[PDB]
Write an enzyme that holds these catalytic residues in place. Structure first.
Site, short mmCIF file in Angstrom:
data_model
loop_
_atom_site.label_atom_id
_atom_site.label_comp_id
_atom_site.label_asym_id
_atom_site.label_seq_id
_atom_site.Cartn_x
_atom_site.Cartn_y
_atom_site.Cartn_z
N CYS A 1 65.73 88.83 16.23
CA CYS A 1 65.06 89.63 17.26
C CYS A 1 65.67 89.34 18.64
O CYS A 1 65.84 90.27 19.45
CB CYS A 1 63.55 89.36 17.24
SG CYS A 1 63.04 87.65 17.55
N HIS B 1 60.54 82.28 25.13
CA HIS B 1 59.92 82.96 23.99
C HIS B 1 58.76 82.23 23.35
O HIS B 1 58.50 81.06 23.63
CB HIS B 1 61.01 83.14 22.93
CG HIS B 1 61.40 81.85 22.29
ND1 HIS B 1 60.76 81.34 21.18
CD2 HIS B 1 62.25 80.87 22.71
CE1 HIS B 1 61.18 80.11 20.95
NE2 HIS B 1 62.09 79.80 21.86
#
Ligand SMILES: OC[C@H]1O[C@H](O)[C@H](O)[C@@H](O)[C@@H]1O
Ligand SMILES: OC[C@H]1O[C@H](O)[C@H](O)[C@@H](O)[C@@H]1O
Lengths: 309, 309
Positions: B149, B176
């Site tokens: 991703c 993240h």
């Protein structure tokens, strides 16, 4: 040997008071805040939701704070100008209110009779100083600034790298929790400010920020273009050297796998993280440095106070 | 026309099923997961703690999963090699277990009768493809990877910038929440992986990561050195054009002030944030781009499935 008065009894003011009360050559004579009472001030200082419960003994007399037997005057003046700094023989007024950070405004503490003033925040007009970076350029000015906690984390690293390899230019990102479930970007002047304490880097550094919901420890992410080629080991060695010398308590260094919280309450201005960083090429490297949002900075405010004394 | 089987019924496997079931030219014939029963699988798919309550109707017959009428076989084999892929006429086996991500391991699905395999994870050996970067370069390979991703967020941006101004080299940082109270650094091959889907950039990109306790939306911080001088408006214009054309659903673009959570469920691979980035000089700029940890990525997995069919 140095009389000081602290304006503002917020997170900074209170921590500065704590640290100062431990400096053998400092004598805190007063604190000021117009939004709280002496009773509330005493309660907060003792049972500090931010800094924890004060180990010492605290009480008051509706007029003075009593810390470990030491009496500290308390005022509630909305205008620093009416404070008895002259009558109290205040050498240095530490203003942590964030509202009297410019020369014109911070001048009030001078009018009130305070010899000098130290602003615990970045200033557009007052000369800024960062311990371990340019406190040696202090030339007797009466009103000084200590910059920000972020700038105090970045500047020392920028100095070390620029002195040894030279910085063509750098771009910084600070991931911080400085005063839920979101990553929030914003601009920051902390990177540009380095140009104020290190004239040679003027216009050569800038960056932005990402606010995250974590404990009170933030980090600096500096991506720099070097003048001279260097290996990551040479860079580490350069920082490590400085962390073992005179700037021992200002510049921290580690090679372990850490988590931000590991540095809660750490008093260094910046803790270089060897493992977190990464170099792509001889002149292009990303460096990482951690910093408690207030402990390193607050300890430096007191250091600056004693240096300007 | 296209028959697919999904191996692994975790976060990604389930989102891939939801999305695949909606593609008119895809026929989901089966799912496999040795750690759960058909009863549990059905309950988890309908009442998904990660993706929410499934809108459609779902039940099972102890053997198959029944979604909006459509029946889907369920298996529980630890070795994909024993699966009935050949019998069911499986065209593409989507492996989202992250356990069969290499050519020799993923080969098991082929051995079972599946015509092709799509790994929903980066691979050291299986050729990788990123929709919007190099899927057109697919040449009939039987086992492919959709990278990660993070790489799906960075690569499309890297391509746009490299095509317009040229990237000399770049350093990335991703803040993240990819699967408390801490900022945690770690390595990541997500940046280097761009060199695989954009060979012209091999060795010219790398970075690291900071894990933070936030919602399922992450961000890439790309500091890049450009070959050709440019203004921030030309950069913005360049990304905006690509986000308005054919790659409309892959590349997002915004100029508003945002919080990561604004992109939860967003299906673009990357959302360029004009306001968050900052440029220091003509050839040195910091670009910011958001990405849901799973939605854009899972949508690409299916896009890639239909493309390699
Ligand atoms: O604990 C610090 C102080 O908090 C307040 C109380 O009114 C006072 O009696 C006490 O000494
Ligand atoms: O068919 C609806 C439901 O039937 C029952 C099963 O235990 C459950 O897992 C399923 O979701």
């Amino acid at each position: 040997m140095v009389s000081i008065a602290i304006n503002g009894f917020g997170r900074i003011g209170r921590l500065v008071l704590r640290i100062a009360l431990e400096r053998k050559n400092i004598d805190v004579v007063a604190i000021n805040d117009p939004f709280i009472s002496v009773d509330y001030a005493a309660y907060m200082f003792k049972y500090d939701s931010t800094h924890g419960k004060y180990k010492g003994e605290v009480s008051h007399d509706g007029s003075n704070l009593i810390i470990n037997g030491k009496k500290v005057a308390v005022f509630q003046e909305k205008d620093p100008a009416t404070l008895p700094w002259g009558k109290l023989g205040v050498d240095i007024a530490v203003d942590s209110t964030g509202v009297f950070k410019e020369l014109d405004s911070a001048q009030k503490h001078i009018d009130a009779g305070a010899k000098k003033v130290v602003i615990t925040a970045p200033s557009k007009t007052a000369p800024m100083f960062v311990v371990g970076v340019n406190e040696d350029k202090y030339n007797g000015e009466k009103i000084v600034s200590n910059a920000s906690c972020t700038t105090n984390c970045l500047a020392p690293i920028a100095k070390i790298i620029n002195d040894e390899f030279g910085i063509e230019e750098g771009l910084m990102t600070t991931v911080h929790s400085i005063t839920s479930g979101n990553i929030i970007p914003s601009s920051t002047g902390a990177a540009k400010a380095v140009g104020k304490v290190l004239p040679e880097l003027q216009g050569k550094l800038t960056g932005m920020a990402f606010r995250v919901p974590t404990t009170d420890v933030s980090v600096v992410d500096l991506t720099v273009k070097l003048v001279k080629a260097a290996t990551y080991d040479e860079i580490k060695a350069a920082v490590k050297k400085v962390s073992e010398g005179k700037l021992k308590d200002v510049v921290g260094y580690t090679e372990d796998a850490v988590v931000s919280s590991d540095f809660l309450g750490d008093t260094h201005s910046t803790i270089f993280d060897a493992a977190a960083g990464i170099q792509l090429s001889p002149k292009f490297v990303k460096l990482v440095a951690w910093y408690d949002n207030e402990y390193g900075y607050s300890t430096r405010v007191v250091d600056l106070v004693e240096h300007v004394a």
